[PDB]
Design a protein around this ligand. Structure first.
Ligand SMILES: O=S([O-])[O-]
Lengths: 127, 127
């Protein structure tokens, strides 16, 4: 949806992502190293793949105040994975993620999802 | 969907939900204290609210083979929140989550989602 490949090492891509997100009000709350946890649990050897859970507290608080169960679809995931041409960054589109909800609830959340999507697409565009 | 209210405290509910998930092959990879992070960032007191990222490594590994970009949807969120009549546990239903995905990936993903959902609803039933 929002996808970009960077010619950058993993650590470089990850620092540039954290920095572009922080410019737009999104902090990183969680991180899962998917290759390291598949190794530890299953003995599998997979290429680099991280999932970062990023969040703007103001937009999150607003969404959770309107619809408390919306925590099931937070935070916004950012994937960084090894690609041929370097590291691919993928960012969850909030508008797309709210489509699991009834249409009336998506209307009720639209201003927040739009604001989040605009800040996220801005971060991506600066990578 | 998938919710139960526990006549219990938040730490009784957390110790308990983690035990019931473990029984069903789901471990907790991440956790966000929503009330403490919104207080920290925004200065507002909010009611107890936790987001636990639960994962079964074998099911996640197969999901990632069907669709490499499914890391944007993982792991499976479990909410514990102060509710009206106790602490409400909500579990993201894998079947609903996958609906956001391209039509083309749905059939291949259906049996991993069915297996996840049966394990989760089992864990929820034992609380
Ligand atoms: O960071 S403030 O702009 O939500």
């Amino acid at each position: 949806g929002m996808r970009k490949t960077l010619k950058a090492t993993l650590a470089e891509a990850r620092a540039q992502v954290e920095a572009a997100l922080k410019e737009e009000g999104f902090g990183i709350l969680t991180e899962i190293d998917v290759a390291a946890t598949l190794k530890a649990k299953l003995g599998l050897e997979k290429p680099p793949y991280l999932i970062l859970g990023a969040c703007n507290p103001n937009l999150a608080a607003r969404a959770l105040e309107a619809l408390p169960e919306i925590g099931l679809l937070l935070p916004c995931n950012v994937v960084l994975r090894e690609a041929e041409e370097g590291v691919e960054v993928l960012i969850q589109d909030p508008k797309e993620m709210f489509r699991v909800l009834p249409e009336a609830t998506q209307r009720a959340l639209a201003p927040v999802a739009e604001e989040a999507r605009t800040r996220l697409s801005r971060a991506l565009s600066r990578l």
